[PDB]
Symmetry: C3
Subunit: 163 residues, 3 copies
Amino acid sequence: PMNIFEMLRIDEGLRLKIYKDTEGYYTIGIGHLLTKSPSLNAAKSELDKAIGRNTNGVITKDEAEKLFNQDVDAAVRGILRNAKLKPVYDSLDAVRRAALINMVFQMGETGVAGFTNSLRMLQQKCWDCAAVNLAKSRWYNQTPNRAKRVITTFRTGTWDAYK
Amino acid sequence: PMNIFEMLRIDEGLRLKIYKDTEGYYTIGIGHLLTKSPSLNAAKSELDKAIGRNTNGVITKDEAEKLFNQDVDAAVRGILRNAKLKPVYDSLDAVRRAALINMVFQMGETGVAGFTNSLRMLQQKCWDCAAVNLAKSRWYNQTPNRAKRVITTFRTGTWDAYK
Amino acid sequence: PMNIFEMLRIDEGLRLKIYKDTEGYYTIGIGHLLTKSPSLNAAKSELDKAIGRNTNGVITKDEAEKLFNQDVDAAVRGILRNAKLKPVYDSLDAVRRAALINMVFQMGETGVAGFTNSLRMLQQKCWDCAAVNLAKSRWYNQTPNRAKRVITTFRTGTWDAYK
Ligand SMILES: [Cl-]
Ligand SMILES: [Cl-]
Ligand SMILES: [Cl-]
Ligand SMILES: [Cl-]
Ligand SMILES: [Mg+2]
Ligand SMILES: [Mg+2]
Ligand SMILES: [Mg+2]
Ligand SMILES: [Mg+2]
Ligand SMILES: [Mg+2]
Ligand SMILES: [Mg+2]
Ligand SMILES: [Zn+2]
Ligand SMILES: [Zn+2]
Ligand SMILES: [Zn+2]
Ligand SMILES: [Zn+2]
């Protein structure tokens, strides 16, 4: 099965039980923030309310997909309120939009809006020209494995780099 | 009001009275050459004949626009006689042609014909690819403020960088 | 007269009599391998069988064109069996396919498949963007005269660089 959830499970990873992030709060699933901070009881309370069952604090893969899919909806909402990202997002097909959401989850919207020239080439359907330009970035140098997969997605509009 | 005259008033500047240029003759308006050289009476004579009124040597903004618009017509005529520039100029819309005329006023037609790769991308309607390539030039490094505005014009075909 | 034979006669050269190549066997025409190796009688035997007349070992220009045209057919067959090259080759017009065959004769299919980004831009009909990218290669630095002609062919789809 290949979709946005599986895409981020590969790029970011899955955590089926509560953990702490890099400075520094309680998290679950694919980067789902629960509370800030530092009592585990408050985070365990936020968990049960969010899923709608008994847990302390362990979930399933289907439950984690439910949390992640709500984050994507909130992310899409964010992108649509941003004048710098809305025209790109609008012009793209569903799979190329997943590559743009993947980037937003990694660096935030201010970071993604920084990819102006490449985002504009994508808008013009210059897939290959944008692929070449995206690979000449600091993002590509620092996380090349993730960046190569995201670039293939923007280039093809298929899930090929994740299969 | 936004047009080619206002565009060059911003990039090059307006002189409502006679002056001397960088080596070295009598000039008025947006770089309008009067005579070479060095008597101010000959230049003042050329002025009155060109406008069709009394002046020694001071003009209005509307009079300066008349002189400038004649230079653009002569510039367009020059571009059309050039095999290297005519195909680009022909393919462009009115606002993108103003960006190309702006470049010709800054560096001359031999200088602009030197932008071969970028001019060809413009011909293919590869706006964004040409914007990126134009920014990687010595012209961009030496006059970045003017170059950024001209590049936005080539990219959009709107007057946005001048409003 | 301008076609693929004349194109390679310019880029690689014509040999109307048997010779030895750079390590190291008997060759004729535009790089046509006869046998490996090292008896000239075996090569002279292979020659007569291939052309269908008396020779030891000297041919005409029309006979050399016959040998070369068989190599192009074998080259096209090779490209079509390659998943990395078949989609590009299919999308191109006859003259742009001749530029791609020229590259295959110079560096082989593994070498040409290495031009991924540029081949993809050609597929998208981004002629000018691919021309710029192809010129930024080691191939261009090592053989610029040949590379410039091949790049003009990919850019225009005309024989202009060879006329
Ligand atoms: Cl492209
Ligand atoms: Cl573009
Ligand atoms: Cl192009
Ligand atoms: Cl490009
Ligand atoms: Mg989506
Ligand atoms: Mg990585
Ligand atoms: Mg105009
Ligand atoms: Mg400046
Ligand atoms: Mg052919
Ligand atoms: Mg050479
Ligand atoms: Zn392109
Ligand atoms: Zn483009
Ligand atoms: Zn292009
Ligand atoms: Zn491009």
